[PDB]
PDB file of C-alpha atoms in Angstrom:
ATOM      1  CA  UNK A   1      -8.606   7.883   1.434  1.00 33.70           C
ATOM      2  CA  UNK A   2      -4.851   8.153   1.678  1.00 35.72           C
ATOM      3  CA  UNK A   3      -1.362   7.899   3.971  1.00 35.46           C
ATOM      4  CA  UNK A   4      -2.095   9.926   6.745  1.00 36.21           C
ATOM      5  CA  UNK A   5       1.384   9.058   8.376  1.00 34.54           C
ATOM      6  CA  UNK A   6       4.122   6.552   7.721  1.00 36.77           C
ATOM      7  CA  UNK A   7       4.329   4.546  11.553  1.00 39.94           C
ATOM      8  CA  UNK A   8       7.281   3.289  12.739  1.00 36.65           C
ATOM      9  CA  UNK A   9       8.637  -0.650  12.604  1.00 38.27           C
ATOM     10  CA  UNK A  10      11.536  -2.257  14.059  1.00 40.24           C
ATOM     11  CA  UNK A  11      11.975  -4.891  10.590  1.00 39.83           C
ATOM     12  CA  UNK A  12      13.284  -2.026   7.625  1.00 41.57           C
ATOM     13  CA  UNK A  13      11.450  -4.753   5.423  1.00 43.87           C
ATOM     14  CA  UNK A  14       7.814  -4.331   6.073  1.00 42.38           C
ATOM     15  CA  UNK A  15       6.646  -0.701   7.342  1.00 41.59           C
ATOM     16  CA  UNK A  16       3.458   0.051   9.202  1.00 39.06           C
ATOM     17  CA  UNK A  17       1.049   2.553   7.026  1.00 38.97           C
ATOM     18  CA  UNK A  18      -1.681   4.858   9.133  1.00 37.16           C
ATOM     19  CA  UNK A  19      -4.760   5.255   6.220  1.00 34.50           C
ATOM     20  CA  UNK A  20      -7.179   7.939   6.802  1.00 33.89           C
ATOM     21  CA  UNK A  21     -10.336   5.359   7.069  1.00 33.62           C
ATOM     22  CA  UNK A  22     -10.140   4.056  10.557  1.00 34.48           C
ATOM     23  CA  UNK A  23     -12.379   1.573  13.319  1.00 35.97           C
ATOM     24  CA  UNK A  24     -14.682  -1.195  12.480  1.00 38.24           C
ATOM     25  CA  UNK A  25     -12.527  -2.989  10.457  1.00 35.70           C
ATOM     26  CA  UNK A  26     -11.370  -2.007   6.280  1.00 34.20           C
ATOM     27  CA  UNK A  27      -9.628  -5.532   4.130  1.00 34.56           C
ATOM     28  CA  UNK A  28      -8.200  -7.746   6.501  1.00 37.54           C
ATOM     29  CA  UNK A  29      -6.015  -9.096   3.819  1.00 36.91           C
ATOM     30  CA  UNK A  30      -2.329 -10.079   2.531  1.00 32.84           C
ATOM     31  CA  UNK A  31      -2.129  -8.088  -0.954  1.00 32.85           C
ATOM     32  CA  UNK A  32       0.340 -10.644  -2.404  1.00 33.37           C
ATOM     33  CA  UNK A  33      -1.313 -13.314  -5.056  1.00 34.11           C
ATOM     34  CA  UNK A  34      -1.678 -10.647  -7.302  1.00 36.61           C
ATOM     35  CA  UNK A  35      -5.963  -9.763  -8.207  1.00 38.41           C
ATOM     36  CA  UNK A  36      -6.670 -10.108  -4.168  1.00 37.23           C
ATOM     37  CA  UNK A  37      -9.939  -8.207  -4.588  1.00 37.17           C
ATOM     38  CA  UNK A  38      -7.723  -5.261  -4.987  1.00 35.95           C
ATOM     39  CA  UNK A  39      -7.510  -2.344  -7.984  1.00 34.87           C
ATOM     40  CA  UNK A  40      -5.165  -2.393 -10.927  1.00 35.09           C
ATOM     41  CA  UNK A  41      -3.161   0.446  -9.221  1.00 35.69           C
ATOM     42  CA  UNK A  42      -2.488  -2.039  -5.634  1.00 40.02           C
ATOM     43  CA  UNK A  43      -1.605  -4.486  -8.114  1.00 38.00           C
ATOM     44  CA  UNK A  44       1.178  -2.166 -10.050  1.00 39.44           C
ATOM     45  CA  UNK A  45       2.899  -1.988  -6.822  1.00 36.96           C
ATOM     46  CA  UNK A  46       3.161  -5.623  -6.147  1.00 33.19           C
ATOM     47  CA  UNK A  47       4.731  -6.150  -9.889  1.00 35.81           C
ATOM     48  CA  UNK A  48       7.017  -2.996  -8.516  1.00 36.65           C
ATOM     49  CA  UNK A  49      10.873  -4.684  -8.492  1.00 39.21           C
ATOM     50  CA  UNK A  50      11.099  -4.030  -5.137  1.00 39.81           C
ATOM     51  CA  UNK A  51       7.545  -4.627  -2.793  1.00 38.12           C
ATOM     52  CA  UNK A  52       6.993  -8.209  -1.567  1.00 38.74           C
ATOM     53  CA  UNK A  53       3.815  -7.882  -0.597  1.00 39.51           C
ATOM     54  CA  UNK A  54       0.827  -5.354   1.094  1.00 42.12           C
ATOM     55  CA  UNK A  55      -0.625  -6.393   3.972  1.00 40.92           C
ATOM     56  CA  UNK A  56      -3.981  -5.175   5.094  1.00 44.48           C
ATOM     57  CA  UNK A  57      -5.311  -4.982   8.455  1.00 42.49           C
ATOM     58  CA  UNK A  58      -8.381  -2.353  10.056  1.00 44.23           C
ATOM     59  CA  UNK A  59      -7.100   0.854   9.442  1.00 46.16           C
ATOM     60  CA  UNK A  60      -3.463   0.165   8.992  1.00 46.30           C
ATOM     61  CA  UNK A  61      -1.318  -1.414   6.199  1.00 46.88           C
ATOM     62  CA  UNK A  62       1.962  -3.302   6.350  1.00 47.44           C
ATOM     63  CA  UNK A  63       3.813  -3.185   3.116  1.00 45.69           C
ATOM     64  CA  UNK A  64       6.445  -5.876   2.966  1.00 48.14           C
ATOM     65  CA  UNK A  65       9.775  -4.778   0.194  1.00 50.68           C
ATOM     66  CA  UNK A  66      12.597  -7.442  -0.604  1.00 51.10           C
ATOM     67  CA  UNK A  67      15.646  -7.716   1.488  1.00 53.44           C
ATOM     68  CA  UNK A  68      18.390  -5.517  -0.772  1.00 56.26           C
ATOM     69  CA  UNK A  69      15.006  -3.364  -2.177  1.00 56.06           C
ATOM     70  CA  UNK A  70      15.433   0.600  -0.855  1.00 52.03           C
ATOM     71  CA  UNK A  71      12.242   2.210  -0.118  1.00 52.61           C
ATOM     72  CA  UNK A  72      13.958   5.814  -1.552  1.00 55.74           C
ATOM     73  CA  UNK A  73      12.753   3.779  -4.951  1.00 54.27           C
ATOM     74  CA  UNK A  74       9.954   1.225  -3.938  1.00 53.40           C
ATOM     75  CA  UNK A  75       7.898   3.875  -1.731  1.00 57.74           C
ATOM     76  CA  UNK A  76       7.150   6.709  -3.947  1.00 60.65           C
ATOM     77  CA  UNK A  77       6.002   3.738  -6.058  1.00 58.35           C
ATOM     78  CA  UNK A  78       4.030   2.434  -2.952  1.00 58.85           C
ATOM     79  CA  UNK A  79       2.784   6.383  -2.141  1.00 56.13           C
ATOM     80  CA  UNK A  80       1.524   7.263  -5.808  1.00 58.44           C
ATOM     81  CA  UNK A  81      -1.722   5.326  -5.643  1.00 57.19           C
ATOM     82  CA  UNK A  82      -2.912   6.738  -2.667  1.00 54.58           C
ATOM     83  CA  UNK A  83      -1.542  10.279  -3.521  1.00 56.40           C
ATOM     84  CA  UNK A  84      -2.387  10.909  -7.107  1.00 56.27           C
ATOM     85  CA  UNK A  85      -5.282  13.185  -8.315  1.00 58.24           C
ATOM     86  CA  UNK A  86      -8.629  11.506  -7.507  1.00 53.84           C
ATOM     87  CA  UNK A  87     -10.859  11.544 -10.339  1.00 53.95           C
ATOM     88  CA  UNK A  88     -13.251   9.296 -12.060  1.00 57.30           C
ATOM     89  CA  UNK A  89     -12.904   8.161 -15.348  1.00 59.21           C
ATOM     90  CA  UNK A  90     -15.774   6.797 -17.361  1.00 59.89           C
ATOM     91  CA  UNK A  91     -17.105   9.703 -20.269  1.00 62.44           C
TER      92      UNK A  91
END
């Protein structure tokens, strides 16, 4: 459960995102009303100044920035959630 690879687009705005889960069919869903059955951490990344919105389709995402927005600030934002140390939390 993470970015396998970055895929390439031909619109700098929204970027194609290769997850490791794959086939069938994950969320088919546009991340962008903020609480769209997604976690607090998806949700962090759409109040990012920068991201638009996260698309969701099968295995791959498409995560829409603003126009002027640079992903060498908005993606390590983007990229923390599903790179960070996987633990649970409960006690």
């Amino acid at each position: 459960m993470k970015i396998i690879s970055i895929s390439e687009t031909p619109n700098h705005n929204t970027m194609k995102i290769t997850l490791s889960e794959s086939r069938e069919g994950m969320t088919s869903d546009t991340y962008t009303k903020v609480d769209d059955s997604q976690p607090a951490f998806i949700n962090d990344i759409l109040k990012v100044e920068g991201v638009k919105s996260i698309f969701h389709v099968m295995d791959f995402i498409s995560v829409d920035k603003e126009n002027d927005a640079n992903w060498e600030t908005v993606l390590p934002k983007v990229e923390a959630v599903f790179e960070l140390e996987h633990h649970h939390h409960h006690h």
